[PDB]
Amino acid sequence: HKILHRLLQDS
Amino acid sequence: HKILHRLLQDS
Amino acid sequence: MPPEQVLILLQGAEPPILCSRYTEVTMMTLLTSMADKELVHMIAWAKKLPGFLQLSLHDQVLLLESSWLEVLMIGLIWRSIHCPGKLIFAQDLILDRNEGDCVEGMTEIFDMLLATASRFRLLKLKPEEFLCLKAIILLNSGAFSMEPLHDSTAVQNMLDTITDALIHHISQSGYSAQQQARRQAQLLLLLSHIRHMSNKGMEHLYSMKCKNKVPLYDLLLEMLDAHHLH
Amino acid sequence: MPPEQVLILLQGAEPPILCSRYTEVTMMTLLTSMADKELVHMIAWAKKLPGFLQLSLHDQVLLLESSWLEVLMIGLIWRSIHCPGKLIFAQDLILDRNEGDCVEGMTEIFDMLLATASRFRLLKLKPEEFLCLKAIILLNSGAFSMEPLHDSTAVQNMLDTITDALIHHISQSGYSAQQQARRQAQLLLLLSHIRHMSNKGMEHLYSMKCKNKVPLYDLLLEMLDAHHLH
Numbered sequence A, B: 001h002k003i004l005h006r007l008l009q010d011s
Numbered sequence C, D: 001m002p003p004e005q006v007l008i009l010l011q012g013a014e015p016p017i018l019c020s021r022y023t024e025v026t027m028m029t030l031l032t033s034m035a036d037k038e039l040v041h042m043i044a045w046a047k048k049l050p051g052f053l054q055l056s057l058h059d060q061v062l063l064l065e066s067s068w069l070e071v072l073m074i075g076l077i078w079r080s081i082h083c084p085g086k087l088i089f090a091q092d093l094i095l096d097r098n099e100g101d102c103v104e105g106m107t108e109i110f111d112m113l114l115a116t117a118s119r120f121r122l123l124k125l126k127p128e129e130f131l132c133l134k135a136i137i138l139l140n141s142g143a144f145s146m147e148p149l150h151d152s153t154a155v156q157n158m159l160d161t162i163t164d165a166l167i168h169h170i171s172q173s174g175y176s177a178q179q180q181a182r183r184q185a186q187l188l189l190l191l192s193h194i195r196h197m198s199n200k201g202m203e204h205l206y207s208m209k210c211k212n213k214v215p216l217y218d219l220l221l222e223m224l225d226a227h228h229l230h
Ligand SMILES: C[C@]12CC[C@@H]3c4ccc(O)cc4CC[C@H]3[C@@H]1CC[C@@H]2O
Pocket: C031, C032, C034, C035, C038, C072, C073, C075, C076, C089, C109, C200, C201, C202, C204, C205, C206
């Protein structure tokens, strides 16, 4: 995973 | 000049 | 979903206006700082695009990984459309062609952006046109790199909805059926040059940081590493 | 000049069908040999394009110097449109994706060409469409690199005549006004990916020959040297 995966699964 | 200059000024 | 609503949705999805806060390291820090900050909001921008969230997480990262620099530069060009010989990265960060000398090879990249900016004026580019282009850039990427799209057709569906939105916009801008069909051509032909600057920007941003001169940003570096250059 | 005559003129200007006559050096020799031979006839092809000869000699070299690899690859892709997993460089020179391993980094470039070939099928690309694209490629280049165009508008005039020819062709191919205006979009969006492969091909062809492994051709090397890479 990445920070991209985090920012995309945010709200 | 180049070979391009020659081939362009050809016929 | 009708296209005229698509044009309003594209405007609503627009990221916020950002602000900032020179030698080689300073120039690079300032531009890479602005890139990382815009990268964060570009993630939010993509999510608001219709159908983007319905894609798999694997496809969402794929489009953003492939086009993030293109998306950045069209944004920088569009902010500088009405300021000549100057690149408007942020409202309080105004650079001209001259001070690119501080960075090796930078002054080369600035001119292609500035020429693309001066082009946008001559075409009298409109904001709706820019919104579709920047959106089209995101989805026209991920057509090869590599990696495959799980739902390649769903992305084309979103691409065709933005295509129809740009078509609709031009159909009611005061253009006859002769210049109507050609304005679309003149705008899409610009995408090749933007992609060209993308490959030049990626390669420049890779030589740096491999020269250990780019600050540690965890998002910017993840996006560069997503291309796996050598 | 009416567009339907432009479509016939583009067909008439087509270069002849060429023939040829594996390890790393052999693969590179064969492909660079075919490139140099096609480069010679590509000069003749450009001269036949309407308005090309009326340009200055400075502008004629400029468009060919900037787009020669793009023009080459769309030709190679178009010859391989109806042969899967295979690149048809010449009629008697048929290569598949597998034997690109002989050259370092070659197998990467083959896949983008093959994907662009498989794309052309799905779009059911027609010969008239390809002729305008390959022509449009030549003139859409020279929009930045660098070097300026003496008569930048004359080139846009020739670009708009080919734009109208491609538009005319689509207007009578069995497409409604909804898909008519979008087929133009789907074909022009391919130009970004082709330009991308151009930058990858140029950079690959530069690493070679700088590794002293590309045969001495005086035209091919003049065209690579025209980009002045490092
Ligand atoms: C990516 C670079 C730093 C960040 C720059 C930027 C930063 C922010 C932005 O909105 C656009 C651009 C385009 C040019 C980019 C530069 C081109 C080369 C350099 O590596």
